[PDB]
Amino acid sequence: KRRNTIHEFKKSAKTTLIKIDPALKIKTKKVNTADQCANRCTRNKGLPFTCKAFVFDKARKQCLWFPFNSMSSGVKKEFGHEFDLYENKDYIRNCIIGKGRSYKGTVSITKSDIKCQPWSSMIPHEHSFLPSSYRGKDLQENYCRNPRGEEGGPWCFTSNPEVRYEVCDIPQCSEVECMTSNGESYRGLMDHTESGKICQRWDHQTPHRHKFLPERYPDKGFDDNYCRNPDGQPRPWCYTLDPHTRWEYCKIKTCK
Amino acid sequence: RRNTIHEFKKSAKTTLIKIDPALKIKTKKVNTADQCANRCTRNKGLPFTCKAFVFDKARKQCLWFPFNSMSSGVKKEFGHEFDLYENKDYIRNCIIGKGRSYKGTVSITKSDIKCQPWSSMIPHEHSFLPSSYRGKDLQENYCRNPRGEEGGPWCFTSNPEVRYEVCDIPQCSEVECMTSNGESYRGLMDHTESGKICQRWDHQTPHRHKFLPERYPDKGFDDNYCRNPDGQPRPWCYTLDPHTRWEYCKIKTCK
Numbered sequence: 001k002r003r004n005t006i007h008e009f010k011k012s013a014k015t016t017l018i019k020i021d022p023a024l025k026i027k028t029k030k031v032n033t034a035d036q037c038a039n040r041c042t043r044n045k046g047l048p049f050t051c052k053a054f055v056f057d058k059a060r061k062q063c064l065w066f067p068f069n070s071m072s073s074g075v076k077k078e079f080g081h082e083f084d085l086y087e088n089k090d091y092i093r094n095c096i097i098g099k100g101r102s103y104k105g106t107v108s109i110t111k112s113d114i115k116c117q118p119w120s121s122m123i124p125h126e127h128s129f130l131p132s133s134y135r136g137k138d139l140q141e142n143y144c145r146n147p148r149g150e151e152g153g154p155w156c157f158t159s160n161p162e163v164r165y166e167v168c169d170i171p172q173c174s175e176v177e178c179m180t181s182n183g184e185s186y187r188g189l190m191d192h193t194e195s196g197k198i199c200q201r202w203d204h205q206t207p208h209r210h211k212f213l214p215e216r217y218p219d220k221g222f223d224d225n226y227c228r229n230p231d232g233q234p235r236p237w238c239y240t241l242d243p244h245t246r247w248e249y250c251k252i253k254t255c256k
Numbered sequence: 257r258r259n260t261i262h263e264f265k266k267s268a269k270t271t272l273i274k275i276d277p278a279l280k281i282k283t284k285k286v287n288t289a290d291q292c293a294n295r296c297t298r299n300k301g302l303p304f305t306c307k308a309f310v311f312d313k314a315r316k317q318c319l320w321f322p323f324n325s326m327s328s329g330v331k332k333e334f335g336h337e338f339d340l341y342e343n344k345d346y347i348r349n350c351i352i353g354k355g356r357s358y359k360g361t362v363s364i365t366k367s368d369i370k371c372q373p374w375s376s377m378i379p380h381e382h383s384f385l386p387s388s389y390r391g392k393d394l395q396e397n398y399c400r401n402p403r404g405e406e407g408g409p410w411c412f413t414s415n416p417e418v419r420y421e422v423c424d425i426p427q428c429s430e431v432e433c434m435t436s437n438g439e440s441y442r443g444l445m446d447h448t449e450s451g452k453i454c455q456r457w458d459h460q461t462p463h464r465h466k467f468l469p470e471r472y473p474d475k476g477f478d479d480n481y482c483r484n485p486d487g488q489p490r491p492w493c494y495t496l497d498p499h500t501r502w503e504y505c506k507i508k509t510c511k
Binding site for chain 1 (some may be wrong): 334336449
């Protein structure tokens with residue numbers, strides 16, 4: 001069956017990750033394209049660990065899959081000409097879309113600034129939200145999550161014995177992103193259209209062929225699948241993953 | 257005048273983020289990165305030995321660090337208004353000649369014996385205290401050549417039966433290599449074949465030139481590395497000698 005999930009990733013060209021923590025493990029395989037790395041990364045039971053990122057080794061044509069990303073305290077980014085780093089946005093996004101069903105970031109305090117209780121802990125609050133019973137929901141550490149996609153967004157059980165749970169205070173991506181005038185200068189991370197369609201990566205020619213090759217417009221900010229306004233529009237836009245919608249404008253508020 | 261920015265490796269649109277919460281920095285409003293560099297290298301210029309700095313292009317300020325990107329307590333991160341500069345002496349993976357200026361992190365001898373810390377008198381008592389040798393960076397247990405002696409960087413060894421031994425750090429001349437005429441050379445050779453220091457490509461002094469890095473994004477005009485952008489027999493660089501506009505560099509052909 002078909003996939004194509006590379007658009008879920010943030011690329012850092014000519015970049016790899018170096019271990020600080022000596023314990024960290026990786027898995028490798030000979031693979032023809034970064035797209036394949038991505039698909040293997042997002043499909044789990046595909047790897048022995050939850051894959052958060054991978055490097056594509058362009059010289060040796062191999063994927064290096066990681067249970068960590070660049071935000072882990074146990075690693076650091078380093079330059080490497082033959083390597084491209086790809087990090088699944090779910091884990092690094094600093095904001096939520098809607099109810100934040102996809103949120104897998106590291107915010108670990110409630111709206112009232114209470115440190116969250118670890119999901120694997122029954123203390124101080126006993127509960128049935130065990131990581132086991134919720135696969136793909138990344139109920140890891142004490143991170144705010146919305147495993148059942150409920151109104152209110154990501155939440156957590158709190159380390160305070162008197163407050164069983166509370167929602168966390170994680171802004172909508174729509175409130176975090178903003179642009180000036182028509183957004184020609186916009187270099188933000190908005191990556192969905194104003195109707196919620198997922199953007200196509202500029203570095204891809206599928207499903208839509210286009211002239212905006214990042215390498216020939218190095219000044220336009222054609223990174224990943226972020227909405228951009230390279231051609232004098234009212235506002236930024238992107239090609240769409242919907243084969244029936246070549247491109248659509250994005251919704252980005254004016255700064256201030 | 258001191259002009260020392262050419263001693264630094266620049267990482268554009270890059271800053272350093274703390275992992276170790278203890279690390280301190282010093283800041284000041286300054287007009288140019290050149291000034292940050294001079295302050296960074298200047299003896300007794302700061303409360304710590306400055307290994308690196310960031311130039312904040314937005315706020316026009318220097319952020320001086322007692323650490324560089326190779327410290328386990330920090331990590332590089334993207335930042336549009338920040339340029340990172342690291343003094344090459346601490347990050348160089350090789351020595352020039354006797355390695356007088358070597359301030360790297362190699363800490364084993366040629367026989368793979370772990371070095372004894374300079375501040376320690378055990379197992380070998382000695383008079384090479386960091387205080388007696390300012391600017392020689394006798395820190396931790398790193399191989400050093402504080403007296404600029406023939407054998408290159410060395411250390412007292414953690415082995416009680418071996419007082420000291422030279423370390424095994426390659427000449428930069430053996431680490432760097434190029435193919436054909438070096439048009440593709442993107443290595444770190446930064447002095448001419450006669451040993452003159454190269455001028456940074458992003459500088460127009462002491463020599464004015466047309467090779468603006470922004471105009472030739474494909475040529476590898478980074479820092480002051482020897483490059484062959486114009487079809488020469490080998491890479492070259494403008495030099496910091498006002499009387500020598502440019503000179504070829506010495507780089508061996510790759511094996």
